Amino acid sequence: ISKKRKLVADGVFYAELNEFFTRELAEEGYSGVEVRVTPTKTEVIIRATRTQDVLGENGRRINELTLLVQKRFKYAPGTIVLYAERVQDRGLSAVAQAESMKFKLLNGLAIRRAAYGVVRYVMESGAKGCEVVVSGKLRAARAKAMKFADGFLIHSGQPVNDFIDTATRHVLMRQGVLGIKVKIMRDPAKSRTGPKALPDAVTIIE
Protein backbone atom coordinates (compact mmCIF):
# COMPACT_ATOMS: atom_id res chain seq x y z
CA ILE A 1 0.00 0.00 0.00
CA SER A 2 1.18 3.53 -0.77
CA LYS A 3 2.14 5.94 2.00
CA LYS A 4 -0.75 8.28 1.18
CA ARG A 5 -3.32 5.50 1.45
CA LYS A 6 -1.57 3.98 4.47
CA LEU A 7 -1.64 7.16 6.55
CA VAL A 8 -5.19 7.94 5.38
CA ALA A 9 -6.29 4.44 6.41
CA ASP A 10 -4.51 4.87 9.75
CA GLY A 11 -6.53 8.02 10.34
CA VAL A 12 -9.69 6.22 9.25
CA PHE A 13 -8.94 3.35 11.64
CA TYR A 14 -8.35 5.82 14.46
CA ALA A 15 -11.73 7.42 13.72
CA GLU A 16 -13.40 3.99 13.64
CA LEU A 17 -11.92 3.02 16.99
CA ASN A 18 -12.80 6.41 18.46
CA GLU A 19 -16.45 6.13 17.46
CA PHE A 20 -16.64 2.49 18.57
CA PHE A 21 -15.33 3.35 22.03
CA THR A 22 -17.50 6.47 22.14
CA ARG A 23 -20.57 4.29 21.65
CA GLU A 24 -19.39 1.40 23.83
CA LEU A 25 -17.75 3.06 26.86
CA ALA A 26 -20.15 5.99 27.28
CA GLU A 27 -21.32 4.96 30.76
CA GLU A 28 -17.71 4.17 31.70
CA GLY A 29 -16.69 7.78 31.02
CA TYR A 30 -14.65 7.26 27.86
CA SER A 31 -12.54 10.27 26.92
CA GLY A 32 -10.34 9.36 23.97
CA VAL A 33 -8.06 6.80 22.36
CA GLU A 34 -4.50 6.85 21.08
CA VAL A 35 -2.94 4.41 18.62
CA ARG A 36 0.77 3.69 19.05
CA VAL A 37 2.43 1.54 16.38
CA THR A 38 5.41 -0.57 17.61
CA PRO A 39 7.15 -3.03 15.23
CA THR A 40 5.83 -6.00 17.23
CA LYS A 41 2.39 -4.84 18.39
CA THR A 42 -0.09 -1.97 18.16
CA GLU A 43 -1.17 -0.42 21.46
CA VAL A 44 -4.45 1.43 21.95
CA ILE A 45 -4.40 3.67 25.02
CA ILE A 46 -7.95 4.45 26.16
CA ARG A 47 -8.60 7.45 28.41
CA ALA A 48 -11.79 6.87 30.40
CA THR A 49 -12.68 8.59 33.67
CA ARG A 50 -13.45 5.16 35.16
CA THR A 51 -10.45 2.94 34.42
CA GLN A 52 -11.99 0.08 36.40
CA ASP A 53 -15.23 -0.47 34.49
CA VAL A 54 -13.29 -0.47 31.22
CA LEU A 55 -11.00 -3.14 32.66
CA GLY A 56 -13.78 -5.18 34.25
CA GLU A 57 -13.64 -8.08 36.66
CA ASN A 58 -10.12 -9.52 36.28
CA GLY A 59 -9.90 -7.66 32.97
CA ARG A 60 -12.92 -9.41 31.42
CA ARG A 61 -14.24 -6.27 29.74
CA ILE A 62 -10.90 -5.08 28.36
CA ASN A 63 -10.12 -8.57 27.05
CA GLU A 64 -13.49 -8.80 25.30
CA LEU A 65 -12.93 -5.34 23.82
CA THR A 66 -9.53 -6.52 22.55
CA LEU A 67 -11.27 -9.55 21.06
CA LEU A 68 -13.82 -7.29 19.37
CA VAL A 69 -11.17 -5.02 17.87
CA GLN A 70 -9.09 -8.01 16.71
CA LYS A 71 -12.08 -9.64 15.04
CA ARG A 72 -13.25 -6.41 13.41
CA PHE A 73 -9.89 -5.20 12.11
CA LYS A 74 -8.45 -8.63 11.19
CA TYR A 75 -5.63 -8.59 13.73
CA ALA A 76 -3.64 -11.71 14.58
CA PRO A 77 -4.21 -12.45 18.29
CA GLY A 78 -1.67 -10.71 20.49
CA THR A 79 -0.76 -8.05 17.92
CA ILE A 80 -3.07 -5.41 19.47
CA VAL A 81 -3.27 -4.43 23.14
CA LEU A 82 -5.87 -2.13 24.71
CA TYR A 83 -4.69 -0.25 27.82
CA ALA A 84 -7.21 1.87 29.75
CA GLU A 85 -4.78 4.22 31.45
CA ARG A 86 -6.48 7.36 32.81
CA VAL A 87 -8.04 10.76 32.24
CA GLN A 88 -5.67 13.02 34.17
CA ASP A 89 -8.25 15.81 34.65
CA ARG A 90 -11.91 15.02 33.99
CA GLY A 91 -13.00 18.66 34.26
CA LEU A 92 -10.83 19.63 31.27
CA SER A 93 -12.20 17.04 28.83
CA ALA A 94 -15.06 18.39 26.73
CA VAL A 95 -16.02 14.88 25.61
CA ALA A 96 -16.19 13.61 29.19
CA GLN A 97 -18.20 16.62 30.36
CA ALA A 98 -20.58 16.36 27.40
CA GLU A 99 -21.12 12.66 28.11
CA SER A 100 -21.73 13.35 31.81
CA MET A 101 -24.26 16.07 31.01
CA LYS A 102 -26.01 13.81 28.51
CA PHE A 103 -26.24 11.13 31.21
CA LYS A 104 -27.65 13.65 33.70
CA LEU A 105 -30.27 14.93 31.26
CA LEU A 106 -31.20 11.36 30.33
CA ASN A 107 -31.68 10.07 33.87
CA GLY A 108 -33.48 13.27 34.83
CA LEU A 109 -32.09 16.65 35.83
CA ALA A 110 -33.10 20.18 34.93
CA ILE A 111 -31.24 21.58 31.94
CA ARG A 112 -30.03 24.64 33.82
CA ARG A 113 -28.96 22.62 36.87
CA ALA A 114 -27.02 20.06 34.84
CA ALA A 115 -25.39 22.66 32.60
CA TYR A 116 -24.32 24.86 35.50
CA GLY A 117 -23.01 21.80 37.31
CA VAL A 118 -20.85 21.00 34.30
CA VAL A 119 -19.74 24.63 33.99
CA ARG A 120 -18.91 24.93 37.69
CA TYR A 121 -16.98 21.65 37.71
CA VAL A 122 -14.99 22.68 34.62
CA MET A 123 -14.18 26.10 36.06
CA GLU A 124 -13.09 24.69 39.42
CA SER A 125 -10.98 22.13 37.54
CA GLY A 126 -8.67 24.94 36.42
CA ALA A 127 -10.18 25.78 33.03
CA LYS A 128 -9.93 29.37 31.83
CA GLY A 129 -13.52 29.42 30.59
CA CYS A 130 -16.40 27.07 29.83
CA GLU A 131 -19.54 27.27 27.71
CA VAL A 132 -22.45 24.83 27.53
CA VAL A 133 -25.10 25.19 24.83
CA VAL A 134 -28.29 23.12 25.11
CA SER A 135 -30.40 23.39 21.96
CA GLY A 136 -33.80 21.92 21.25
CA LYS A 137 -37.23 21.56 22.81
CA LEU A 138 -36.26 22.40 26.38
CA ARG A 139 -39.92 22.23 27.33
CA ALA A 140 -42.10 21.22 24.40
CA ALA A 141 -41.99 24.43 22.40
CA ARG A 142 -40.31 26.31 19.52
CA ALA A 143 -36.95 24.60 20.46
CA LYS A 144 -34.89 27.41 21.96
CA ALA A 145 -31.17 27.30 22.75
CA MET A 146 -29.72 28.09 26.19
CA LYS A 147 -26.11 29.12 26.79
CA PHE A 148 -24.34 28.80 30.15
CA ALA A 149 -20.88 30.37 30.25
CA ASP A 150 -18.27 31.12 32.87
CA GLY A 151 -14.84 32.63 32.49
CA PHE A 152 -13.68 33.88 29.12
CA LEU A 153 -13.47 32.12 25.77
CA ILE A 154 -11.54 33.01 22.63
CA HIS A 155 -13.35 32.00 19.46
CA SER A 156 -11.66 32.00 17.22
CA GLY A 157 -8.21 31.94 15.62
CA GLN A 158 -5.30 29.51 15.84
CA PRO A 159 -5.51 29.53 19.68
CA VAL A 160 -8.81 27.64 19.44
CA ASN A 161 -7.04 24.73 17.79
CA ASP A 162 -4.21 25.22 20.28
CA PHE A 163 -6.24 25.22 23.52
CA ILE A 164 -10.01 24.80 23.08
CA ASP A 165 -11.87 21.52 23.63
CA THR A 166 -15.26 21.16 21.95
CA ALA A 167 -17.65 18.22 22.11
CA THR A 168 -21.16 17.74 20.73
CA ARG A 169 -23.62 15.10 21.92
CA HIS A 170 -27.16 14.13 20.96
CA VAL A 171 -29.43 13.43 23.94
CA LEU A 172 -32.51 11.47 22.89
CA MET A 173 -35.40 12.66 25.01
CA ARG A 174 -38.98 11.46 24.68
CA GLN A 175 -39.66 14.67 22.72
CA GLY A 176 -36.98 14.88 20.08
CA VAL A 177 -33.25 15.36 20.44
CA LEU A 178 -31.44 17.86 22.63
CA GLY A 179 -28.05 19.02 21.40
CA ILE A 180 -25.28 19.48 23.96
CA LYS A 181 -22.20 21.51 23.03
CA VAL A 182 -19.38 21.81 25.55
CA LYS A 183 -16.47 24.21 25.04
CA ILE A 184 -13.56 24.36 27.48
CA MET A 185 -10.71 26.85 27.26
CA ARG A 186 -7.90 25.26 29.21
CA ASP A 187 -5.35 27.52 30.86
CA PRO A 188 -2.46 28.15 28.44
CA ALA A 189 -0.19 28.79 31.44
CA LYS A 190 -0.31 25.14 32.56
CA SER A 191 -0.04 23.82 29.01
CA ARG A 192 2.91 21.45 29.59
CA THR A 193 3.14 21.29 25.76
CA GLY A 194 2.94 23.84 22.97
CA PRO A 195 2.66 27.60 23.48
CA LYS A 196 2.24 28.64 27.11
CA ALA A 197 0.31 31.88 26.52
CA LEU A 198 -1.91 33.61 24.03
CA PRO A 199 -0.10 35.03 20.97
CA ASP A 200 -0.92 38.61 21.98
CA ALA A 201 0.09 38.07 25.62
CA VAL A 202 3.31 39.96 26.36
CA THR A 203 5.18 39.53 29.65
CA ILE A 204 8.05 41.85 30.56
CA ILE A 205 10.88 41.19 33.01
CA GLU A 206 12.46 43.66 35.40
Q: Which residue ranges make up the site for RNA (CB under 7 A)?
A: 1-5, 133, 135-137, 140-143, 145, 147, 152-160, 162, 168, 170, 172, 174-179, 181, 198-200
**Coil/strand/helix, residue 30:** strand
E strands, the chain, are 30-37, 42-48, 80-84, 130-135, 145-150, 165-172, 177-184
d(CA 188, CA 153): 12
For residue 14, the partner it binds in other proteins, RNA, none, with Cβ less than 5 to 8 A by kind, is other proteins
Q: What is the separation, in whole angstroms, between the first and last Cα of the chain?
A: 58
CB of 10 vs other proteins, minimal distance in Å: 8
For residue 81, the partner it binds in RNA, other proteins, none, with Cβ less than 5 to 8 A by kind, is none
User: Closer CB to RNA, residue 90 or residue 169?
Assistant: 169
For residue 140, the partner it binds in other proteins, RNA, none, with Cβ less than 5 to 8 A by kind, is RNA
Closest CA to 55 of 27, 29, 83, 78: 83
E strands, 97-204, are 130-135, 145-150, 165-172, 177-184
Piece of the chain touching other proteins by CB under 8 A; list 20-28, 78-86, 103-111, 131-139? 20-28
CB of 106 vs RNA, minimal distance in Å: 13
**Coil/strand/helix, residue 21:** helix
User: Closer CB to RNA, residue 58 or residue 76?
Assistant: 76
Chosen residue from 19, 27, 85, 124 binding other proteins by CB under 8 A = 19
